[PDB]
Amino acid sequence: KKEVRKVRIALASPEKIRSWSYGEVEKPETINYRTLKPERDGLFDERIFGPIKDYECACGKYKRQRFEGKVCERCGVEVTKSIVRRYRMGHIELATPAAHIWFVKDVPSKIGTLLDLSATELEQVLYFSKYIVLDPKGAILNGVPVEKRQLLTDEEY
């Protein structure tokens, strides 16, 4: 019941992405015409986001406010209005990483300045097009000892 005295922007931990998350949207299925209902697990599924209806559930095992804070034994629907549907978050698990454009194309490349790379051109170079790196150890040569952090191509790799 306390007063909000300080607000704070902080980076998101992948685990935190999951923590605020309810379900994962794993398919491009908006809503199937026949029934203006959410298609499958898709972008509007109600598990992942929330009760498509008032206080009522899915199938209808529990339908009013007396048991407001409990979930259906057979179907998991906790309910307030459909607002719980408009505040919940879902996450998508990308295959191979991609980066925030907010951090890479701001005049000073927050990653370009932090990572000593060509502040604006080396980034754009390997981010959107093609160039690879060696993590801990790789005893054999190219001509010189293993590159601890430098990057090699698919052909010489």
Binding site: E3, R5, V7, R8, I9
Partner: protein, 593 residues
């Protein structure tokens, strides 16, 4: 007390009345004044209907002298032509000379028309409206009875032929068209000033919103001195600043130190009323005071905020400022309205530290001046038998410092506008601030606007709420951080915890826009500049937005840190002598057995 404050020795003008309201406000009290207003309101309106003042075509009366002055100037124009048809006057000289003929002749008809109304028709419908604070403008009247004479071409070069007609008589077919060009630029101008007037009010607010009055007389007495005299109108001649201007600077202010002037003892901390600032001018007249020590926002100690003794008088009411008044906004606003009348481009160049069109090389060194004659470039040198500060002054630049006398740091060595950064370097911050302030007022003054310096100060202060670091302690050297946050650092590093690690900084000047772009909290910054950037950085570094200031704390829909949310008055309880005794009965019952 009604005849004590009224002058029945002259017709009641908007000003005589303006001044009667003000007096009545100070003398008799707020609501009683309100009574007076409606009273005047009621009779002014009634007398008005009965007076029977009405515009008539014949009411606009043309001077009989118009015919003369036009002919007199007409023949003179022929002389200018015959003088060119011979080859005496350059193509240019001809033009500039003809303009000057009309420029004067038009102004001549101006005073003529009025002279007619003054001597023969004191009660002319059109006239009286203009004289009375009612309606009318000396330039306008002229376009009806006199003549609206010069209307410039599309570009800006005024037309060579004037508009010989008045609106009384048929403004001809072409004279109309010719005059049209100007009207169109005027309408386009008004459209782009309206947008820029609201934007300036946005930027002023972006940096001064947080500024609010929350205090106790801040004890750091470092005050500002309000000058009463101005240097160069004519090369060098000291003069008493205008009544208006000086008033603008000392009215409702709080003296920093005691001043004994013409006989009376103006105490310290006293708020000088308009009458008091009338005293000091009369005294400077006699020659007893050249400056005036007065508290000002420019030198407050309260990091985020400004105190009662520093701000001054002007609340909407005439008594000292009440603690908890949003001054930042109130200031930002009083500057953004008049702007729509301006010009403005300069005001922008001023709030935004920039390198104006016509720059003026400031003397970074203070010694005396000296000039040279070689062909290509001239040169103004501030020198000593030790060193000179070479000032490259190209062909087009007009220098007025001569071969010979002294030139303090940041002094105009060229003519025109100045670059704040340089002036900061040369003469120091206490000089930039006062420069900015006066140089900004210069425009509104010249336009009729009368705004108190308080406001432009509030703002300009924030332009300099930041400074660079050259001798570290906690964090690395090159850094631009909040001035007062260093005063904190240095204060506890020398006072509370030992080891004098002096935190040497450098005063940094920034424009209203960049100070808002780059401030402490992000919420405020997310509002104008680039939401994209602002947030990036604020994220990287887990930034905790401590909510202070009205912009950031409005977004949350939380109560305003200023106003009633004022920590000073957010808590105040009320009582009835009946509940006062009852609570005391609760204390009495506390005695056990």
């Amino acid at each position: 007390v009604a005849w004590e404050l009224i002058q029945l020795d002259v017709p009641q003008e908007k000003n005589s009345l303006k001044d009667l309201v003000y007096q009545a406000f100070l003398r008799l009290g707020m609501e009683k004044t309100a009574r007076l207003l409606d009273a005047l309101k009621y009779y002014g309106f009634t007398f008005s209907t009965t007076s029977g003042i009405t515009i008539g075509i014949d009411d606009a009366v043309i001077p009989e002298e118009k015919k003369q002055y036009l002919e007199e100037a007409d023949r003179k124009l022929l002389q200018i032509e015959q003088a060119y048809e011979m080859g005496f006057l350059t193509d240019r000289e001809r033009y500039d000379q003809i303009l000057q003929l009309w420029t004067e002749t038009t102004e001549k008809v101006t005073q003529a028309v009025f002279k007619n109304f003054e001597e023969n028709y004191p009660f002319n419908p059109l006239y009286v409206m203009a004289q009375s604070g009612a309606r009318g403008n000396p330039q306008q009247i002229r376009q009806l009875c006199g003549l609206r004479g010069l209307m410039q071409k599309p570009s800006g070069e005024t037309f060579e032929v004037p508009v010989r007609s008045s609106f009384r008589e048929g403004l001809t077919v072409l004279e109309y068209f010719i005059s049209s060009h100007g009207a169109r630029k005027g309408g386009a101008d008004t459209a782009l000033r309206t947008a820029d007037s609201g934007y300036l009010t946005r930027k002023l607010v972006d940096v001064t919103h947080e500024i609010v009055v929350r205090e106790a007389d801040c004890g750091t007495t470092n005050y500002i001195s309000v000058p009463l005299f101005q240097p160069d109108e004519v090369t060098r001649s000291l003069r008493l600043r205008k009544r208006a201007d000086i008033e603008a600077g000392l009215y409702g202010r709080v003296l920093a130190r005691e001043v004994e002037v013409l006989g009376v003892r103006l105490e310290e901390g006293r708020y000088l009323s308009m009458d008091d600032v009338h005293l000091l001018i009369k005294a400077a007249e006699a020659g007893e005071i050249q400056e005036v020590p007065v508290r000002s926002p420019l030198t407050c100690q309260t990091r985020y905020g400004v105190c009662q003794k520093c701000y001054g008088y002007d609340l909407s009411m005439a008594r000292p400022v009440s603690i908890g008044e949003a001054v930042g906004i109130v200031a930002a606003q009083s500057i953004g309205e008049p702007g729509t009348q301006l010009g403005l481009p300069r005001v922008i160049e001023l709030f935004e530290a920039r390198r104006p069109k016509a720059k003026a090389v400031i003397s970074e060194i203070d010694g005396v001046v000296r000039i040279e004659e070689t062909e290509e470039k001239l040169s103004v040198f501030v020198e000593s038998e030790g060193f000179s500060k070479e000032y490259k002054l190209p062909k087009e630049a007009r220098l007025l410092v001569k071969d010979g006398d002294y030139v303090e740091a940041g002094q105009p060595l060229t003519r025109g506008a100045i670059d704040p950064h340089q002036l900061l370097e040369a003469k120091g911050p206490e000089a930039v601030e006062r420069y900015l302030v006066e140089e900004i007022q210069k425009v509104y003054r010249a336009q009729g606007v009368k705004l108190h310096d308080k406001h432009i100060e509030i703002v300009v202060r924030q332009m300099m709420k930041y400074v660079e670091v050259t001798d570290p302690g906690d964090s690395r050297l090159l850094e631009g951080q909040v001035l007062e946050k260093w005063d904190v650092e240095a204060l506890n590093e020398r006072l509370i915890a030992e080891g004098k690690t002096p935190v040497a900084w450098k005063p940094l000047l920034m424009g209203v826009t960049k100070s808002a772009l780059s401030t402490k909290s992000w919420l405020s910054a997310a509002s104008f500049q680039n939401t994209t950037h602002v947030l990036t950085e604020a994220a990287i570094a887990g930034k905790k937005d401590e909510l202070i200031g009205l912009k950031e704390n409005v977004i949350l829909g939380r109560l305003i840190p200023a106003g009633t949310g004022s920590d000073f008055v957010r808590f105040t309880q009320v009582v009835d002598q009946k509940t006062l005794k009852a609570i005391e009965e609760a204390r009495k019952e506390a005695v056990e057995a």
